[PDB]
Design a protein around this ligand. Structure first.
Ligand code: OQ6
Length: 237
């Protein structure tokens, strides 16, 4: 997260850190708890991943340095990538992780609601991106979960900024005209969370952008409301 600030413990309890363990253990991407056995993340995250055997899901983490050899994690039973995914910039950048066991919800690990049926025309004005990613284009994974409030931009404006890409209704963009706050490397798969009527909704999944927090170059997110039918089909199969 560029231009963000440190989170406190328990502030974003749906946020998980997905680790790979090959060839060494490290944060791979963010993700969001959406059900007791289900993490929603980005399909791009699994580009180098030989199987779910090497993945670990850590919940209730504020600092990456909390994770030691005895820290509990969830194994991953299945990675479900959207069958039309090819690369992040061409859309369908969405994946479900089915966990090997059920999360018991606590103060530190809670689900976030999907965008609600009937809310297709809500104007979200309180949206936040969170993650352990870089604070600038050449940086390092951050120890403490970072947060930044970021305004949504219309798909019409977003397309005008990304003349070489096809911005579709299955994407949503967010960014300041003058830059300065954005997701960056290591934030992908994490949530774009928006609060509406005091309820948090998983509006976006961090996906791609041209650089990090550049002027007139918004971040591009998977538009989760357009995948609710796909999520429900996979999670009640
Ligand atoms: C200690 O372990 C470590 O070093 N871990 C570690 C280090 C680096 C990485 C890393 C690098 N790339 N990515 C991803 C995609 C890869 C499949 C993971 C990525 C790409 C683009 C964006 C992004 C998103 C938005 Cl919305 C806006 C702008 C951008 N960006 C444009 N240009 N950069 N970002 C964010 N992410 O995350 C993650 C992962 C783990």
């Amino acid at each position: 997260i560029v231009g963000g600030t440190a989170s406190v413990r328990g502030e974003w309890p749906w946020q998980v850190t997905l680790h790979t363990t090959s060839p060494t253990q490290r944060h791979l991407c963010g993700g969001s708890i959406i059900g007791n056995q289900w993490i929603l993340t980005a399909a791009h995250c699994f580009y180098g991943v030989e199987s779910p055997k090497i993945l670990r899901v850590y919940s209730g983490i504020l600092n990456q340095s909390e994770i030691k050899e005895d820290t509990s994690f969830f194994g991953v039973q299945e990675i479900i990538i959207h069958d039309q995914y090819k690369m992040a910039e061409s859309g369908y950048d969405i994946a479900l992780l089915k966990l090997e066991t059920t999360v018991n919800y606590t103060d530190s690990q809670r689900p976030i609601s999907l965008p609600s049926k009937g809310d297709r025309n809500v104007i979200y004005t309180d949206c936040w991106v969170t993650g352990w990613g870089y604070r600038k284009l050449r940086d390092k994974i951050q120890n403490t979960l970072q947060k930044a409030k970021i305004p949504l931009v219309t798909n019409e404006e977003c397309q005008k900024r990304y003349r070489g890409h096809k911005i579709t209704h299955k994407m949503i963009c967010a960014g300041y005209r003058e830059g300065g706050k954005d997701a960056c490397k290591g934030d992908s798969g994490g949530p774009l969370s928006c609060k509406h009527n005091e309820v948090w909704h998983l509006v976006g999944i961090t996906s791609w952008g041209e650089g990090c927090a550049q002027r007139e170059r918004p971040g591009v997110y998977t538009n989760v409301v357009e995948y609710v039918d796909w999520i429900l089909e996979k999670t009640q199969a």
